[PDB]
Design a binder for this molecule. Sequence first.
Ligand SMILES: OC[C@H]1O[C@@H](O)[C@H](O)[C@@H](O)[C@@H]1O
Ligand SMILES: [Ca+2]
Length: 307
Amino acid sequence: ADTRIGVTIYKYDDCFMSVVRKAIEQDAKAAPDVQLLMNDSQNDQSKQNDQIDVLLAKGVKALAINLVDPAAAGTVIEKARGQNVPVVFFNKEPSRKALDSYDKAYYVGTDSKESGIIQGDLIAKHWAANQGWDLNKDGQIQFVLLKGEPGHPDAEARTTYVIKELNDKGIKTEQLQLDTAMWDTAQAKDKMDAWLSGPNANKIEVVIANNDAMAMGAVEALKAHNKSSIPVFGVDACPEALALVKSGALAGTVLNDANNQAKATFDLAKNLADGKGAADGTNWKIDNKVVRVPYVGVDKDNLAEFS
Ligand SMILES: OC[C@H]1O[C@@H](O)[C@H](O)[C@@H](O)[C@@H]1O
Ligand SMILES: [Ca+2]
């Protein structure tokens, strides 16, 4: 009969996870034997926990879980273990210890630091090509940074590695501001607006955001202050962001490959639901229960390949 797979998305109103959610539903449409039970956890781990209980009570044969809280992986694993059901975590990466605590736990995502390195290289390229961006002519990038959720592996790695990569390439940096905007456009717009309204706003040379949603908020705040001359960099290559790379409102971004992350999540979940090896009949390379999908930098010079 039909194989039910339970899926939780941490919040449907996340740009990137909306792409992933839709892609996984398209993938399921192409598997006549599988029924997806899709849940919006509304950015609340307690809601997600209850949703998982309901899915397990409905007899799902696998779970695909996009955690609200990464630290809740253990909690979720113990729920799955109660039914001896496999779980494919995706996009918010559990700790190695959590993954190793249950032989039926897997993870699909990315090499988080790669996105930071790529973003840093993009900034380095554009900085070298636009020395007018060095407003105070000190040879250093005076930056502000809009961080994702504290503790989220992508937020932590993108924040560390964008700056490390710039510095390693011989570009000194001065952090003027850094705060979280929780992956959200409105929070980022308000934070950027505050920074532009504070004393020494005039020192800001480059805006770095851990994702496109926050970058797009910054773009709007810059526009409101007639400061669009300041470049903004993001991560994801969300559809709206690519339009802004085209228009010049966004200086660069980094494709976070939602389509392939969705496909790997679905393929592994379906195999595990069927009691097969996770990668059976696929080309996915699973390394110690993890699949990582490459990022790719995007700017006007290669936009034609992504538009
Ligand atoms: O967990 C959700 C987050 O995942 C990250 O990989 C994406 O870059 C963000 O846009 C998204 O908000
Ligand atoms: Ca400078």
